[PDB]
């Protein structure tokens, strides 16, 4: 499953 570049923002987990 190759990973293409993206204009989507990178996701981060919640900060409590």
């Amino acid at each position, epitope marked *: 499953l190759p990973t293409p*570049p*993206t*204009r989507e923002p*990178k*996701k981060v987990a919640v900060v409590r």
Partner: antibody
Amino acid sequence: EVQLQQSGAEIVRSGASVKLSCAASGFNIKDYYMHWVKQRPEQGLEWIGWIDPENGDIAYAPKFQGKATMTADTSSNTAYLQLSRLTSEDTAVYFCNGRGGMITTDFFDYWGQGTTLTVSS
Amino acid sequence: DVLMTQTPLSLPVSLGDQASISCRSSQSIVHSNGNTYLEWYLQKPGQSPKLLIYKVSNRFSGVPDRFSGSGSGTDFTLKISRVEAEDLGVYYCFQGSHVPWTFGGGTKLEIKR
């Protein structure tokens, strides 16, 4: 105050290589995708490449395959762009751009101030 | 490469007036995934570009509602209602759907006198 800070101007001879840096302060680059962009007055803006600093995934514009090498060091919160075999057509301002910090739908987008490269003997 | 062309090249405007800038791609920039990654930037002299609009019509944080993006397929528009002094500079469109991602050549929004 929160920003991407790029390294200072470089003057370099043709055939040499240079490594430009872009350092985050106020955020963690593991939470961002990083992009590099080239700008010249007459040819305009050009996209160089994309990197996910956390896991090292990379993609380059065809025209920069072999010219550009992107890396990142999450421990120092820094991304790098190496340019090899330099010529006058590499004389430009280089910008880094981080996009990320997305918990649900909101996100952050930061640009470095640009680094000027002059290729000349 | 997918070519992004902007018109007009230069747009003189009086403060308070409306401005509209067009961006055309040489072929469709709808991504496989259904999204259209058409973005608009403003760059002021000496500064980096700043994101105004992403995915055709979505205003980035802090961008006032006088900026609006529209379009579909190969034809897009940025409209600025009530131009303010802080809006002056060069506007670029950008497609991030097909690699290599490409920028338009820019449209200079300039003040009349």
